[PDB]
Design a protein around this ligand. Structure first.
Ligand SMILES: O=c1ccn([C@@H]2O[C@H](CO)[C@@H](O)[C@H]2O)c(=O)[nH]1
Ligand SMILES: [Cl-]
Ligand SMILES: [Fe+3]
Ligand SMILES: [Mn+2]
Length: 499
């Protein structure tokens, strides 16, 4: 009666539907990922072994323009061609508003689980299905979907979650564990939680990211067999054992896919790990599933006319960094400053909002959208020097990366100092920022409402928001207005760790 039970999982796929280059993998010279390749991988596993499940821990939206320009519709369409047994809902599924979340995810032909997001001051749940039971070859797996409260408040834009909220994930996890006890062979939780992923062209040396939250979660509940996590984009080359729970994750974007083979016996109810592999997907090692590819191709054809348009050019690949300035952040802040105009003195934008490199050569509308994919609207406001400095300290804490800043603003911090005391110098046009002085600043609506823990933005006065005018429009308009990429945008270390 002993049975091979196989769990295959992804997380944080982020709309990377086609194979793509990653600067820190084979020096950006080898295609990785591709959802059509992942489909072949899973179909082949499911053909070999009946008791095979495919799960995803959220954040399949947001990234390459195919997601943003369709508000995620194309992503659900493509996912409908893939053999998912269950997924949960990550923060990025909310990027186009929670009404859009309901609208698009209603179209999914695979099960979606989410049991701890509620209407505020209500017992009513946001999603209809907190968990579900998926049985294959006499083996029943109960799968629970949850979002960390901290991560929900930290990374869902304020404007897209008005009137909804995540609630104590630990309380709901134990409740659902207890509700499933005696009804299933194995209990799995898909939990979207923790610190946000680093957004960087440099990979792992650019701000440490770990899975401490998930270890905490596992150690706070009893009776959970597997915790699949997403949100931090930190893969687990071996399962992390906490008590009797295995914690599993991937590096995100379809770079790798996890595969856990268990030996299971229902009679003496026991599972033991038989084999685990976190497999790097190299496009040239896989035949893409033709149906998945066809749906992707049909969507690209629809979008081509809009995205193909040339908006600029760059002599070099434009890069991003999470702990310091990089060219894409310098350009985005300069574009925001340019678009705000008038008396604006400086612009700030978040490192986590910059999602891809822009390759060298002709820059197209699609490339700009893939890099700056958020409906985050231009906001101008007045902040004191003291408030600006508090924002800089929050950035230097590296919990959510540093702010990227406009030309003229320079910030130096020391990451070896205690959080709260890391800013060394902060100057605008060579003069120190002064506590009581009032500065005219530009940013966007995600930061303006306190996104990423940047709370002092919410104290800004004389606030003005431009509806429908996003970071990517500002960037496009920057090149339309005559401006080009400058050497100081390319090499200027406006924000720098002097550790
Ligand atoms: O509207 C949004 C929502 C999220 N994010 C970014 O996405 C990261 C999570 O992947 C967050 O830390 C934040 O920087 C934005 O930039 N804008
Ligand atoms: Cl969390
Ligand atoms: Fe996330
Ligand atoms: Mn993610």
């Amino acid at each position: 009666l002993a049975k091979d039970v196989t769990i295959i999982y992804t997380n944080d796929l982020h709309a990377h539907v086609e194979p793509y280059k990653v600067p820190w993998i084979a020096d950006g010279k080898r295609d990785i990922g591709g959802w059509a390749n992942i489909t072949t991988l899973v179909k082949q596993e499911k053909a070999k072994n009946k008791a095979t499940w495919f799960f995803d821990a959220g954040d399949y939206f947001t990234g390459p323009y195919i997601s943003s320009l369709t508000k995620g519709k194309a992503i659900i369409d493509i996912m409908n061609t893939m053999p998912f047994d269950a997924v949960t809902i990550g923060n990025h599924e909310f990027d186009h508003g929670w009404d859009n979340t309901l609208l698009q995810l209603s179209q999914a032909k695979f099960p979606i689980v989410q049991g701890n997001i509620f209407y505020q001051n209500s017992s009513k749940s946001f999603w209809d299905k907190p968990y579900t039971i998926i049985e294959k070859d006499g083996v029943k797996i109960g799968v629970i979907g949850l979002h960390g409260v901290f991560a929900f408040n930290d990374t869902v834009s304020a404007a897209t979650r008005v009137g909804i909220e995540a609630r104590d994930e630990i309380k709901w996890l134990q409740r659902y564990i207890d509700e499933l006890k005696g009804k299933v062979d194995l209990t799995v939780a898909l939990i979207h939680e923790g610190v946000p992923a680093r957004q960087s062209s440099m990979g792992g040396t650019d701000v440490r990211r770990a899975l401490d939250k998930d270890i905490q979660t596992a150690s706070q509940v009893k009776g959970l067999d597997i915790l699949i996590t997403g949100h931090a984009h930190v893969g687990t080359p071996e399962p992390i054992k906490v008590g009797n729970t295995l914690i599993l994750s991937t590096d995100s974007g379809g770079i790798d896919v996890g595969k856990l083979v268990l030996d299971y016996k229902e009679k003496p109810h026991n599972f033991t790990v038989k084999n685990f592999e976190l497999k790097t997907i190299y496009a040239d090692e896989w035949k893409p599933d033709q149906q998945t590819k066809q749906v992707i191709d049909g969507w690209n054809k629809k979008l081509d006319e809009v995205v193909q348009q040339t908006v600029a050019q760059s002599p070099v690949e434009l890069k991003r960094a999470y702990g310091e300035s990089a060219s894409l952040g310098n350009l985005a802040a300069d574009a925001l400053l340019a678009a705000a105009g008038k008396n604006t003195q400086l612009a700030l934008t978040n490192s986590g909002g910059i999602r891809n490199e822009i390759p060298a050569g002709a820059i197209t509308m699609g490339g700009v959208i893939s890099t700056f994919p958020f409906p985050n609207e231009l906001v101008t406001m007045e902040l004191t020097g003291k408030q600006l400095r508090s924002l800089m300290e929050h950035g230097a804490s590296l919990s959510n990366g540093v702010l990227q800043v406009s030309k003229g603003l320079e910030m130096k911090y020391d990451s070896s100092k205690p959080v709260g005391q890391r800013v060394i110098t902060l100057t605008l046009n060579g003069k120190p920022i002064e506590d009581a002085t009032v500065y005219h600043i530009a940013t966007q609506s995600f930061l303006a409402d306190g996104g990423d823990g940047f709370t002092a933005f919410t104290e800004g006065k004389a606030r003005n928001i431009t509806g429908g005018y996003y970071v990517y429009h500002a960037v496009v308009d920057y090149f339309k207005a005559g401006n080009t990429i400058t050497d100081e945008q390319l090499n200027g270390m406006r924000v720098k760790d002097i550790k």
